[PDB]
């Protein structure tokens, strides 16, 4: 019984930590997306203006 109680508590804590990590990774993902877009667009513009 104590094992199962501790298992439930551990699953709770793991789900919470996973939610936190998902939030952080979402922020990083959006940052990297914006960076990729800006880099590609600056590349295109510099190749359009280097003619």
């Amino acid at each position: 019984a104590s094992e199962q109680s501790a298992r439930m508590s551990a699953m709770d804590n793991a789900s919470t930590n996973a939610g936190e990590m998902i939030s952080s990774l979402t922020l990083r993902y959006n940052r990297a997306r914006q960076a990729k877009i800006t880099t590609e667009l600056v590349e295109i513009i510099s190749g359009a203006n280097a003619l």
Binding site: E40, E43, I44, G47, A48, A50, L51
Partner: peptide, 12 residues
């Protein structure tokens, strides 16, 4: 292409 005067596409 860029030497032939074309504008690059999305990823080069």
């Amino acid at each position: 292409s860029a030497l032939l005067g074309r504008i690059p596409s999305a990823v080069g």
